[PDB]
Amino acid sequence: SGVNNTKKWKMEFDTRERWENPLMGWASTADPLSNMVLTFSAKEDAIAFAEKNGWSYDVEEKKVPKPKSKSYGANFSWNKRTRVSTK
Amino acid sequence: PTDTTTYKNLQHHDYNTYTFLDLNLDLSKFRLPQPSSGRESPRH
Numbered sequence: 001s002g003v004n005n006t007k008k009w010k011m012e013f014d015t016r017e018r019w020e021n022p023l024m025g026w027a028s029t030a031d032p033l034s035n036m037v038l039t040f041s042a043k044e045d046a047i048a049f050a051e052k053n054g055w056s057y058d059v060e061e062k063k064v065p066k067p068k069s070k071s072y073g074a075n076f077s078w079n080k081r082t083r084v085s086t087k
Numbered sequence: 088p089t090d091t092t093t094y095k096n097l098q099h100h101d102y103n104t105y106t107f108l109d110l111n112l113d114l115s116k117f118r119l120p121q122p123s124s125g126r127e128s129p130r131h
Contacts, residue, residue, distance in 0.1 A: 079124035085131060 009040040011050065011057075 016031035040046035043059060050057040074082040 077129075079126065081129055083129040085129070 009043055009046045009062075011038040011040065011046050012036070 013031075013033045013036055016029070016034060018027045018029050018034075020026075021028045038046070038049065040049065043062070047057065047059060074080070075084045075087075077083045
């Protein structure tokens with residue numbers, strides 16, 4: 001339920017091929033940018049950083065949970081379906 | 088004046104398993120019509 005990891009903008013690269021190492025079975029790669037993650041304070045900072053480095057980018061809008069109406073008293077309604085059968 | 092030397096709550100010695108729910112059944116005729124929430128249930 002913690003939300004502390006949904007507060008900063010992140011830049012990550014497109015995932016590339018990983019393959020099995022014949023000796024040990026380890027996951028091998030040829031992608032030098034496979035672990036690169038950059039943190040940004042604003043969407044506009046991240047866009048600016050990608051553009052000067054010549055990287056094509058896709059930007060997705062931040063999703064905030066919608067405000068909700070919580071009423072503990074609704075659990076005991078006279079005539080509504082919100083009445084809970086158990087506690 | 089009342090005797091007030093014996094115990095006058097002795098009827099309960101003759102109660103049985105269904106005494107309470109027989110009185111409840113007997114008392115149904117006097118009750119007033121119940122209110123309604125408008126639905127058959129909260130839908131279980």
